[PDB]
Amino acid sequence: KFVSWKSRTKYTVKPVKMRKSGGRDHTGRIRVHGIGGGHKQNYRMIDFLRFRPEKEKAPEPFEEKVVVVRYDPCRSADIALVAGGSRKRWIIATENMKAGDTILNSNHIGRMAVAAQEGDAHPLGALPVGTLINNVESEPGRGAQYIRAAGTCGVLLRKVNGTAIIQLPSKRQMQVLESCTATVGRVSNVNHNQRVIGKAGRNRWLGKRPNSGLWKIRPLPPMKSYV
Amino acid sequence: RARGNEYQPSNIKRKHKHGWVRRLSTPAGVQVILRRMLKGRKSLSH
Amino acid sequence: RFRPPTPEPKEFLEYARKAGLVIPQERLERPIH
Amino acid sequence: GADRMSKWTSKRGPRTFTKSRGAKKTGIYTSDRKFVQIKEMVPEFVVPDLTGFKLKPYVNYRAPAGIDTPLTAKALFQETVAPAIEKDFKEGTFDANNLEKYGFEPTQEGKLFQLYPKNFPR
Amino acid sequence: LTYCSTRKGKRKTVKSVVHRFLRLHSGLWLRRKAGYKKKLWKKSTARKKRLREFVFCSKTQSKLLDKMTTSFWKRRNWYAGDPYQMYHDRTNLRV
RNA sequence: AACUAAUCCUAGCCCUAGCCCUACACAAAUAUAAUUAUACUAUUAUAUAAAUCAAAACAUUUAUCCUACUAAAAGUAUUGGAGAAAGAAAUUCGUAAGGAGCUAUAGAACUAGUACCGCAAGGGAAAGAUGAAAGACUAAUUAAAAGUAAGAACAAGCAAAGAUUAAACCUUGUACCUUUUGCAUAAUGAACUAACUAGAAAACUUCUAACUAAAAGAAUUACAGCUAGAAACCCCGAAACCAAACGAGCUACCUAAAAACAAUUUUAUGAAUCAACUCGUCUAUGUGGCAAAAUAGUGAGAAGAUUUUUAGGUAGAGGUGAAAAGCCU
RNA sequence: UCUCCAGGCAUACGCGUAUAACAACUCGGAUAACCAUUGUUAGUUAAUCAGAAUAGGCAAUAAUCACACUAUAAAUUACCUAUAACUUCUCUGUUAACCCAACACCGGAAUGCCUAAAGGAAAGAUCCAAAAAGAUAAAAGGAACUCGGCAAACAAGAACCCCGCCUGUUUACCAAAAACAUCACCUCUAGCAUUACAAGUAUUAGAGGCACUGCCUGCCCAGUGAUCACUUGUUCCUAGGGACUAUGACGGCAAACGAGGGUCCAACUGUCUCUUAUCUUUAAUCAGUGAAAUUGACCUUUCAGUGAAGAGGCUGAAAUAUAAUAAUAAGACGAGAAGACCCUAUGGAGCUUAAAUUAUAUAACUUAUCUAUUAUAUAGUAUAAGUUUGAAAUUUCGGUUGGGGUGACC
Ligand SMILES: [Mg+2]
Ligand SMILES: [Mg+2]
Ligand SMILES: [Mg+2]
Ligand SMILES: [Mg+2]
Ligand SMILES: [Mg+2]
Ligand SMILES: [Mg+2]
Ligand SMILES: [Mg+2]
Ligand SMILES: [Mg+2]
Ligand SMILES: [Mg+2]
Ligand SMILES: [Mg+2]
Ligand SMILES: [Mg+2]
Ligand SMILES: [Mg+2]
Ligand SMILES: [Mg+2]
Ligand SMILES: [Mg+2]
Ligand SMILES: [Mg+2]
Ligand SMILES: [Mg+2]
Ligand SMILES: [Mg+2]
Ligand SMILES: [Mg+2]
Ligand SMILES: [Mg+2]
Ligand SMILES: [Mg+2]
Ligand SMILES: [Mg+2]
Ligand SMILES: [Mg+2]
Ligand SMILES: [Mg+2]
Ligand SMILES: [Mg+2]
Ligand SMILES: [Mg+2]
Ligand SMILES: [Mg+2]
Ligand SMILES: [Mg+2]
Ligand SMILES: [Mg+2]
Ligand SMILES: [Mg+2]
Ligand SMILES: [Mg+2]
Ligand SMILES: [Mg+2]
Ligand SMILES: [Mg+2]
Ligand SMILES: [Mg+2]
Ligand SMILES: [Mg+2]
Ligand SMILES: [Mg+2]
Ligand SMILES: [Mg+2]
Ligand SMILES: [Mg+2]
Ligand SMILES: [Mg+2]
Ligand SMILES: [Mg+2]
Ligand SMILES: [Mg+2]
Ligand SMILES: [Mg+2]
Ligand SMILES: [Mg+2]
Ligand SMILES: [Mg+2]
Ligand SMILES: [Mg+2]
Ligand SMILES: [Mg+2]
Ligand SMILES: [Mg+2]
Ligand SMILES: [Mg+2]
Ligand SMILES: [Mg+2]
Ligand SMILES: [Mg+2]
Ligand SMILES: [Mg+2]
């Protein structure tokens, strides 16, 4: 009887009501422990493909206007409503984004380096080595999947030929084509790691059930009389 | 606490748990009815 | 366990007199001789 | 402790449970919950004029009863259809194609009262 | 022992007797001596001679073996050139 | 000099024989929360049976279970921790309505899969008795069971026996079954009445006959044997194990939609005092109780990780668990 | 009419005629009256209470008197564009003292309104014995009681140790705690999308440990020259020759809080010295109704003996009209429960592993098989055969040794 709530085909900026799982799967059995209850929430459909040209428009760099930078219950970072042309779409907000700012979304692969302004989306080839980036996509057109948390910025270590190396926040180096689109700057809510829960009830407000109260080298034969 | 009152009646719950439509939903439930028909039960299901 | 209370039914007259009854008169099929 | 043997009716169960007692529907429920009764769906009692009717509920005990001969298709056919076909055959004005002339109906479609599937109540 | 079989309703022979003992028609049973093929290097010459012999069974042992085998193993067998032809009967036996 | 009771005979049932079946019965309703006249949401068994048990344990294995014609070949060939056990074939033979059964605790569970018990799967009873006629007023028959009544008792004792003129006084006498040990003043079991309630098989031996170097109505045995008859080996009772259904209306946790929190002080709260509400600290009562966990007091929390309501989910090789190996009627 | 008591009326859920009248007086109410019982007849009335056309386009801005006010846990069909139809009221719920607890059960039972205008009766009659239960009063003393201030009090104040940070959570039915959870802190694992984690992305997620804060100190940190050379170290080529090498895992302590476990003082008292009086319950007598465990048979005595710790019943003395009513509990090794304790079974089961036997759970590799390619070759793979890993599965628990370590012994 479990029908997923993620059944909306068409993009909208209206917040969408979420049904909670409880750590259980479509079978009805717990698959992850420690999830339950909490505050009711609404899902605002984020758009991680920064360079999405508007319908019936050409594929070239465009600009959008930041309406508001808002708190999002469903993620560590904060979201910014951005409007351009006749389209409104939620997006992740960088560290310094404010209302009324203008942010560029560029398709052009700069043959030379392009000056980097935080919040604008540029292909990795355009950016210069060393620039802090966020919302990186693995393959051109996929959409952003890495560096999407609060205050998490990766570095662009190297660009050679058609590919570049990205240092993910975990210090794990990844390689992607220079065509991939990465947003510049940090991801905002840099102090999220400084937040203090304080009381056990606060985690029960975020849907975190308490931990359960339940409290390997086989010797080789030649080394069993010394164990 | 005092036990013995584990039955909290509800017609919606009863017909959903042990009703005609529920029994026919799975083949094992159909065989529940087949046994009771063979035995001669006056009540096949709730 | 227990056994059921069967009510366990010159006697019909008392039965119907206590209960009360509509005894419609009957036409005797054979005339009395 | 629920009673499994008594009949399930609308008096039992919560308010949400409702079901009919066997009365035929006479209308339709539109959206926003408006009942619209349909005049044609409501039965009409066709009552004849009984003025000057000689038949009453009971019959004379002196009236002889008749031997039972339940009606058969052959008896109906002979009483009604045989006289025409027999006379027509002698006249020679007979063919298989013109069976409608004697009262045959190839199909029941288009008739107000269809003999099969029956589309009228008693 | 199987006294009444499921298929035939009879007793069954214990095929461990059939593979170890010979029954003479008179009623006697022959056997070998346990260990006659074992560790012969450390056995005395007289001991080995005793082991090689064919030996008879006691009254109770014979009574047991008769219980464990069926009648077919107790019939008189007319084998041409039998080397036990003369041992199937008792002679000069008053007892 | 009689109450409670007792007597009873047929309702049906049992095993065979024979036989393929063509019983699947008005109108209407019903797969919707079945039995609700019409659209909405469409509809669909199962991969190898397992274990108990036998092997005096158990670990390969363990007849039937898991069917292919009778009698013989034959418990033979074979198969097997070569143990317990298991076990063929070639080949031959083959033309056919009844009861030394039951008669109401028996025979079917059956007067009924009902009443009743259980959320459900499921479990599952008891009983009737006139006569030709009841349009003869529903009879009779029986010192007859235990139990009582008619009719309490009268120094002294396993309750009787020997006796006696005499019921009791006198004399003699350590209840029963099993069990200890072949003993108990041990110890188990027994309120009493009626009914019901536990030894079953033919390898060898013995006995009685038929025929006899042969016996047997084919297949077998035989150096007096062979054929037939007769003669035999209990009842009740676990914790367990496995397969398939049924269960989350209790309880554990969860999902969705809803509710409740006065007054007072702090502040801006898993803060304070204290109701409603939730819980169950200590003592007494109760202990077949009002209650298979309560009552009366006294207490802990009481805007929160609070409490409560409704509907849904997770199922036993599992579920749930702020782990008590708690909870899952 | 009087005396007294103080959760009542609606709806939901549930129940299913217990509703009302009459007639009955068998059964049912634990007894009567009377009926909640039996039979017969009746009943609940709704257009407002309650239940039961199609296709597109699009949504930033809580609630709390919503203004101010901040906040954090971030929080409810409409309006438009076209199409289609162009006057309608049937059906069903409606009673009651009611449901779940085997019962007319001192229990359980959601919400709104209200707190006596609604709803009710603690005593069948009598008697005031013991023992038992409950309430109130106490001369003088005031914990001397007791395992302990348990219980009670005209008291309800003050402090100190131990443990746990704190509010929370648990062994429904003997354990509410020092156990569990908890913010904080710490270790480990994972670089990723269309059903959990999650419509998330390392400031994330999962697994697990652990009080925090401040304070302390172990490890570890090539050696000597001094950013430089040797000695080392590690590899090779043959004892030679090259090659290469620029900070902590541990303790010690912090207030507040606690139906936790110890302790003290003050006050207070019938806990006690040392009990008493009153009232209610029960008791007892009268009327009605009427169980339960238990029971070999009993015409059921005391003392000494005998006996296995043991005698109403045996041996020898002794005592002895018969039956009730109300009391006590020495005995009938008094009666009950699934209570305890040791031992036994080639009886079980739960749990753990380093028991034996297995293990197409996952994971990996290897060879085939089948495709792609390629110069032989690297890829993959509806399967088979190996190997490695081990989630699991099945089975077992020799003997002798006041009983338990080890040993030993057969
Ligand atoms: Mg823990
Ligand atoms: Mg029950
Ligand atoms: Mg409930
Ligand atoms: Mg065995
Ligand atoms: Mg086995
Ligand atoms: Mg019977
Ligand atoms: Mg019967
Ligand atoms: Mg008598
Ligand atoms: Mg005497
Ligand atoms: Mg004893
Ligand atoms: Mg076993
Ligand atoms: Mg539930
Ligand atoms: Mg308040
Ligand atoms: Mg508080
Ligand atoms: Mg309090
Ligand atoms: Mg408090
Ligand atoms: Mg819990
Ligand atoms: Mg524990
Ligand atoms: Mg249970
Ligand atoms: Mg009434
Ligand atoms: Mg009356
Ligand atoms: Mg009545
Ligand atoms: Mg309405
Ligand atoms: Mg009403
Ligand atoms: Mg009672
Ligand atoms: Mg009043
Ligand atoms: Mg009263
Ligand atoms: Mg009184
Ligand atoms: Mg006082
Ligand atoms: Mg005093
Ligand atoms: Mg003292
Ligand atoms: Mg002291
Ligand atoms: Mg106290
Ligand atoms: Mg604590
Ligand atoms: Mg607490
Ligand atoms: Mg407890
Ligand atoms: Mg609890
Ligand atoms: Mg507590
Ligand atoms: Mg407790
Ligand atoms: Mg702890
Ligand atoms: Mg406490
Ligand atoms: Mg003092
Ligand atoms: Mg009396
Ligand atoms: Mg006496
Ligand atoms: Mg004595
Ligand atoms: Mg004496
Ligand atoms: Mg008395
Ligand atoms: Mg006594
Ligand atoms: Mg033994
Ligand atoms: Mg065993």
Numbering used by the authors:
A (entry chain D): 62 to 276, 286 to 297
B (entry chain 2): 47 to 92
C (entry chain d): 43 to 51, 57 to 80
D (entry chain 9): 14 to 135
E (entry chain 3): 94 to 188
Paper lines:
S-adenosylmethionine (SAM) is the principal methyl donor in cells and is essential for mitochondrial gene expression, influencing RNA modifications, translation, and ribosome biogenesis. Structural analysis by cryo-electron microscopy demonstrated that SAM-dependent methylation is required for peptidyl transferase centre formation during mitoribosome assembly. Our cryo-EM analysis of the mtLSU from SAM-depleted mitochondria reveals ten distinct assembly intermediates demonstrating how methylation can orchestrate mitoribosome maturation. During translation, peptide bond formation occurs in the PTC, predominantly formed by 16S rRNA during the late stages of mtLSU assembly and involves the folding and methylation of the A and P loops.
States B-D exhibit a mature CP but still an immature PTC, which remains bound by NSUN4-MTERF4 heterodimer along with an array of state-specific factors, including GTPases, GTPBP7 (states B-D), GTPBP10 (states B1,2) and the methyl transferase MRM2 (state D). States B1-C1 were captured by incubating mitochondrial lysate with GMPPNP and subjecting the sample to chemical cross-linking prior to grid freezing. The states B-D, with an overall resolution ranging from 2.8 to 3.62 Å, allowed the identification of bound factors and conformational changes in rRNA and protein elements at the maturing PTC. In state B2, uL16m was stably accommodated, and H89 moved ~14 Å to align with a basic cleft formed by uL16m and GTPBP10, acquiring its mature position. This provides insights into how these two factors promote H89 folding. Since in mitochondria there are two ObgE homologues, GTPBP5 and GTPBP10, rRNA H89 can be correctly accommodated and uL16m and bL36m are stably recruited by GTPBP10, as illustrated in our B2 state. This is consistent with cryo-EM structures of bacterial LSU assembly intermediates, further supporting a conserved role for ObgE in ribosome biogenesis and adding to the previously reported human mtLSU intermediate (PDB 8PK061).
